Short mmCIF file of C-alpha atoms and ligand atoms in Angstrom, two decimals:
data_model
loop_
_atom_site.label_atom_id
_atom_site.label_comp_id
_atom_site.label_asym_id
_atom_site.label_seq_id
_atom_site.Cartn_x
_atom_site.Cartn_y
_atom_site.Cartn_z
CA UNK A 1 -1.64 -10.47 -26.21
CA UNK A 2 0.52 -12.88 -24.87
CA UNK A 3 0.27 -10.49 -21.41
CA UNK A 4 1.24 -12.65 -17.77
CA UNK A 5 -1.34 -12.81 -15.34
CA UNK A 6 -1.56 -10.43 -12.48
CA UNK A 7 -2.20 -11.54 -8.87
CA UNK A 8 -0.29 -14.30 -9.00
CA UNK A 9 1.26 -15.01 -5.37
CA UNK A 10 4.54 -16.67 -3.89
CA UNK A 11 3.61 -18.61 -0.86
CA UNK A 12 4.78 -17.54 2.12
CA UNK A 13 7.50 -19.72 3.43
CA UNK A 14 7.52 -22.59 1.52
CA UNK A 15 9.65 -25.51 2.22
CA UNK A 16 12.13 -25.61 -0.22
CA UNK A 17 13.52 -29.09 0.38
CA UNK A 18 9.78 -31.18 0.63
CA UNK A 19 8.86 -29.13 -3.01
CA UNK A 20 12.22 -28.90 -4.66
CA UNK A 21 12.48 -32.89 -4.97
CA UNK A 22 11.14 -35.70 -6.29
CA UNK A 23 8.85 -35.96 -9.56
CA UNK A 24 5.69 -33.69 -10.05
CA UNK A 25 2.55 -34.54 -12.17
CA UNK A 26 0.69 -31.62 -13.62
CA UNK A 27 -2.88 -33.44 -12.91
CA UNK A 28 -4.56 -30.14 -14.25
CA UNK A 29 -3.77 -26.98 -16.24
CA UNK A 30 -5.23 -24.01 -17.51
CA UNK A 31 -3.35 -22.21 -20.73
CA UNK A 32 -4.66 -18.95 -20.43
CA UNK A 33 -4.20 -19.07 -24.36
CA UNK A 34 -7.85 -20.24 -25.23
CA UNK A 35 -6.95 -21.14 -28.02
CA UNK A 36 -3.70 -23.18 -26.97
CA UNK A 37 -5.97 -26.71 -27.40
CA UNK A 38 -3.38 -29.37 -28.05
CA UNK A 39 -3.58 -31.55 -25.28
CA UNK A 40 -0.15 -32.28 -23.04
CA UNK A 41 1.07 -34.30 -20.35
CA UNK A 42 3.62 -33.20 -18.32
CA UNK A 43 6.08 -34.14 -15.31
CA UNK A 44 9.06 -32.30 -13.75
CA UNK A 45 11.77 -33.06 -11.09
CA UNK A 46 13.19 -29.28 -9.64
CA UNK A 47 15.60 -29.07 -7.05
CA UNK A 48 17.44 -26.49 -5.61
CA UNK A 49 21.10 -25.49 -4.04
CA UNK A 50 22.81 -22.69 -2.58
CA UNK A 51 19.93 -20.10 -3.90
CA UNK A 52 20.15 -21.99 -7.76
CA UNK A 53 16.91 -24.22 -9.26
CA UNK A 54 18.24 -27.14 -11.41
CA UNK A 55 15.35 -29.11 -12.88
CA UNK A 56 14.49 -31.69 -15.31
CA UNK A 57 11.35 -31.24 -17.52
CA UNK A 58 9.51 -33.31 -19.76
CA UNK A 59 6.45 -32.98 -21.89
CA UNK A 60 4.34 -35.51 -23.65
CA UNK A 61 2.23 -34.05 -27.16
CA UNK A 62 -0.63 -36.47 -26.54
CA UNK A 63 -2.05 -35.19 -30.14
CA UNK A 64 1.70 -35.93 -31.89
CA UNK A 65 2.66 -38.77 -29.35
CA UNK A 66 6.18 -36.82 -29.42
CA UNK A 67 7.58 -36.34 -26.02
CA UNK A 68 10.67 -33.75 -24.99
CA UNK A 69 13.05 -32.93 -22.56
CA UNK A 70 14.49 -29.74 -21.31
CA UNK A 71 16.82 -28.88 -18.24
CA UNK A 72 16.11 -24.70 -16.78
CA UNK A 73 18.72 -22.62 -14.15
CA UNK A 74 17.68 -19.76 -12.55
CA UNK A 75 18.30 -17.78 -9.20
CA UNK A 76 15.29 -18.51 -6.70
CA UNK A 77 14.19 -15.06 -5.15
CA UNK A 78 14.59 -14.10 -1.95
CA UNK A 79 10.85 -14.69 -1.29
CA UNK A 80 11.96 -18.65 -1.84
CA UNK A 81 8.97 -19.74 -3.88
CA UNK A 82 9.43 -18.00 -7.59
CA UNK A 83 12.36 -18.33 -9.80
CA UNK A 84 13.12 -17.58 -13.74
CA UNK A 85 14.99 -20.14 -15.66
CA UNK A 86 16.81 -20.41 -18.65
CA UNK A 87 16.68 -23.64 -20.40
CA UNK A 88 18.35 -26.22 -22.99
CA UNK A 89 16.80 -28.99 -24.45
CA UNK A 90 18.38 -32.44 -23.62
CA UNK A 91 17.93 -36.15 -24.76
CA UNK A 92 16.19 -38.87 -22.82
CA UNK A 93 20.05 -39.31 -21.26
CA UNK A 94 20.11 -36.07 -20.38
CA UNK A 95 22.56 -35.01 -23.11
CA UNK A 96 22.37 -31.17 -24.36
CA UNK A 97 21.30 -31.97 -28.21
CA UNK A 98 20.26 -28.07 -28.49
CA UNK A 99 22.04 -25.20 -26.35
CA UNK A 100 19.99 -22.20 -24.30
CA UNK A 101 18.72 -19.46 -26.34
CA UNK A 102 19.35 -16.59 -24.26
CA UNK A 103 16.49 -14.51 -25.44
CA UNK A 104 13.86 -17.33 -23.55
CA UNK A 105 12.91 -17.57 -20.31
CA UNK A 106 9.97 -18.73 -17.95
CA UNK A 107 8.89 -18.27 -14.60
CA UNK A 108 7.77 -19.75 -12.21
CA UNK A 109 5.75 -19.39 -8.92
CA UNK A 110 4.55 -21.89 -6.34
CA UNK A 111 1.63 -20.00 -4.95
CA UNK A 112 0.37 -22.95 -2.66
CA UNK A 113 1.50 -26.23 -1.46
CA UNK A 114 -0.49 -28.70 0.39
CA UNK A 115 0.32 -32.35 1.75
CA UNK A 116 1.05 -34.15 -1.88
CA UNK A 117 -0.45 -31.36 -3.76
CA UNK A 118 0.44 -27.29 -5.50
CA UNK A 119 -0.43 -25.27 -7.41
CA UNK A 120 2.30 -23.33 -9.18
CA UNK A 121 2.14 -20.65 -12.24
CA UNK A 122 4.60 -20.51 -15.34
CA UNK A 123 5.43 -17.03 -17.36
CA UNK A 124 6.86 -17.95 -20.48
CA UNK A 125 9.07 -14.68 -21.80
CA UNK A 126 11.04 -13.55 -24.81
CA UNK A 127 13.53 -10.60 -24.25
CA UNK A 128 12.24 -10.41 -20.85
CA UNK A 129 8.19 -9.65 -22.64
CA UNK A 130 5.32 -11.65 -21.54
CA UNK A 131 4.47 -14.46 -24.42
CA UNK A 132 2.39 -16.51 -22.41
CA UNK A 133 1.13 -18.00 -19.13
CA UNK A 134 -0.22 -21.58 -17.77
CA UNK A 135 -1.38 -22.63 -14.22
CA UNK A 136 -0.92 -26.03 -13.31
CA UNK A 137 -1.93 -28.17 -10.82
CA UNK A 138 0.44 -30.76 -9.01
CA UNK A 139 0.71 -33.76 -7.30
CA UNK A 140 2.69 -36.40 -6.58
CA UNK A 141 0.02 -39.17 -7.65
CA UNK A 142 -1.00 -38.65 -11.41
CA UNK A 143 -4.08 -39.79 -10.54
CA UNK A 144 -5.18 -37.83 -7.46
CA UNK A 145 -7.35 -34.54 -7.21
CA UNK A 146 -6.08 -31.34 -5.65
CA UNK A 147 -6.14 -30.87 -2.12
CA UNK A 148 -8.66 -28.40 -1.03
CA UNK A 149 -6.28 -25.65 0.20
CA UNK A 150 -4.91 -25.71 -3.68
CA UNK A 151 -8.64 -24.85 -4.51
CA UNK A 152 -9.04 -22.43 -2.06
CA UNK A 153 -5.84 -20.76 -3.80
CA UNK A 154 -6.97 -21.13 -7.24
CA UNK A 155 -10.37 -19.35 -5.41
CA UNK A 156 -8.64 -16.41 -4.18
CA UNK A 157 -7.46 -15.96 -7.76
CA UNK A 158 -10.95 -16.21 -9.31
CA UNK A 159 -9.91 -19.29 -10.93
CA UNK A 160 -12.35 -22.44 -10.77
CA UNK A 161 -11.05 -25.97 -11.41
CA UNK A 162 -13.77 -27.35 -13.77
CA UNK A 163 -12.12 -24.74 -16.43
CA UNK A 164 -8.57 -26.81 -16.37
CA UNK A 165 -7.23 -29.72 -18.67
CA UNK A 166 -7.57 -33.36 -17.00
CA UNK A 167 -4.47 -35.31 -17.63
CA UNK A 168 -5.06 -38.49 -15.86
CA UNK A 169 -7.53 -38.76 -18.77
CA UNK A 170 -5.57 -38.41 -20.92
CA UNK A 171 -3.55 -41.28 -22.74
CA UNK A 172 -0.15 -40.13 -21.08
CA UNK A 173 3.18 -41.56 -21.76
CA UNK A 174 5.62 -40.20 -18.86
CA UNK A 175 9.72 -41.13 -19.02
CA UNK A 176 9.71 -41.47 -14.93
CA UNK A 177 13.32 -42.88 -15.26
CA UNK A 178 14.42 -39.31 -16.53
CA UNK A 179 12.90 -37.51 -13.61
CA UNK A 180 13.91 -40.07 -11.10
CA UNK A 181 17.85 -40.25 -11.91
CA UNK A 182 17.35 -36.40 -12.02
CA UNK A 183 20.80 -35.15 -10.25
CA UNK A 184 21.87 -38.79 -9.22
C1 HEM B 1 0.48 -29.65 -18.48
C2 HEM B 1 0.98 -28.42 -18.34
C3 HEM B 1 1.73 -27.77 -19.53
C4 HEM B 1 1.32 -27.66 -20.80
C5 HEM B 1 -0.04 -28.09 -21.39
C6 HEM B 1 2.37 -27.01 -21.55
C7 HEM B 1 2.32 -26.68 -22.89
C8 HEM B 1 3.41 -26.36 -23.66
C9 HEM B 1 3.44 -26.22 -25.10
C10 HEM B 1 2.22 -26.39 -26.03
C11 HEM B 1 4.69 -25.91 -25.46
C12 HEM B 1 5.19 -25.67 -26.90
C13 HEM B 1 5.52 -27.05 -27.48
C14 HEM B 1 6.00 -26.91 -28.90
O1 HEM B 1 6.68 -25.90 -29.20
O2 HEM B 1 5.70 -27.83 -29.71
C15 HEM B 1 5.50 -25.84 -24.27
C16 HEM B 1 6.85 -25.55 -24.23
C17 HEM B 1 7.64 -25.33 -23.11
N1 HEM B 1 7.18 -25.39 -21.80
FE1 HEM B 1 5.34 -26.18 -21.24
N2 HEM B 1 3.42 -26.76 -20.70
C18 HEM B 1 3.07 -27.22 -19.44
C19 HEM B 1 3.83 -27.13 -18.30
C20 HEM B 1 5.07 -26.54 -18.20
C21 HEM B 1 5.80 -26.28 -16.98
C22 HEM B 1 5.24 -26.61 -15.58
C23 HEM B 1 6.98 -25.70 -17.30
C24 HEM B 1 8.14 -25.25 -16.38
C25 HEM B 1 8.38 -25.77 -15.16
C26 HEM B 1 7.03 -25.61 -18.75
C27 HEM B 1 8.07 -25.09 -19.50
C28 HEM B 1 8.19 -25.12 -20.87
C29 HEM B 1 9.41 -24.87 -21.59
C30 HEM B 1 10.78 -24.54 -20.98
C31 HEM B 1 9.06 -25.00 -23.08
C32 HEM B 1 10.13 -24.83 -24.20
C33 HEM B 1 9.61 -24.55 -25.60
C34 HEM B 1 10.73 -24.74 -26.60
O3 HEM B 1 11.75 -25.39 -26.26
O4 HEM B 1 10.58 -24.25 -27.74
N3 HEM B 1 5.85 -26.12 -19.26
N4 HEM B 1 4.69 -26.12 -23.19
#
């Protein structure tokens, strides 16, 4: 039901310190949950040290207009392009206002990355079970479309674009300041 997809690729080689830094847009994303039809916006800031991903996440509930923050830690693998995270959920100050449940997880592979663009897939688990999955699109202008190498990867996957989410549509309210000051 809530099964992870298959065929979903680490690329090879990635460089670690051009994707783990700065602040990425999700500019388009496909919940593979057809039914998952709230509309989001969302922005993250992941970095990475000594084989450990720190990020800073934040979501935007365009239907609600209620935004949140989380922080996930997790190894990266030896492949250097997926990693599984365990995460709190902070204030806009980056305080911890609830602690890590242990029995969630997600993770996460960058299976392409392209001049100011990626495309990365998220596995959401409980107990280490598959409870959902979401491919999103990045970049590091909300408002630009994918490079064509990221379509060429969401090809290989039988995935076409036209079936994602559109944020920059989308009446999205981002907290940049919390993804910018991310680690300073
Ligand atoms: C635009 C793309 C995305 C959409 C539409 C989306 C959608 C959602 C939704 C609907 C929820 C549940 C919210 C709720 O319980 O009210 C959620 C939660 C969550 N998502 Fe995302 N997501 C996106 C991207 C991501 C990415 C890229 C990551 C990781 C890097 C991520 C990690 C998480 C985490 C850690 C939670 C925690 C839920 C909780 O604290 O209960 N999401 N997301």
């Amino acid at each position: 039901p809530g099964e992870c997809s298959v065929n979903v690729i680490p690329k090879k080689n990635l460089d670690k310190a051009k994707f783990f830094s700065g602040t990425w847009y999700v500019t388009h994303y496909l919940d593979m949950d057809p039914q998952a039809t709230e509309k989001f916006c969302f922005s993250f800031a992941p970095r990475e040290s000594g084989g450990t991903v720190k990020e800073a996440l934040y979501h935007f509930n365009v239907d609600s207009k209620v935004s949140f923050y989380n922080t996930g830690t997790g190894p990266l693998e030896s492949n250097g392009a997926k990693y599984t995270a365990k995460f709190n959920t902070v204030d806009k100050k980056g305080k911890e206002i609830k602690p890590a449940d242990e029995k969630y997880s997600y993770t996460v592979t960058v299976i392409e990355a392209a001049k100011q663009s990626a495309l990365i897939h998220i596995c959401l688990q409980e107990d280490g079970k598959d409870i959902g999955d979401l491919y999103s699109v990045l970049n590091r202008n909300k408002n630009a479309l994918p490079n064509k190498k990221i379509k060429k990867a969401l090809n290989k996957v039988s995935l076409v674009l036209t079936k994602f989410v559109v944020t920059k549509d989308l009446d999205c309210k981002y907290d940049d300041k919390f993804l910018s000051s991310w680690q300073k």
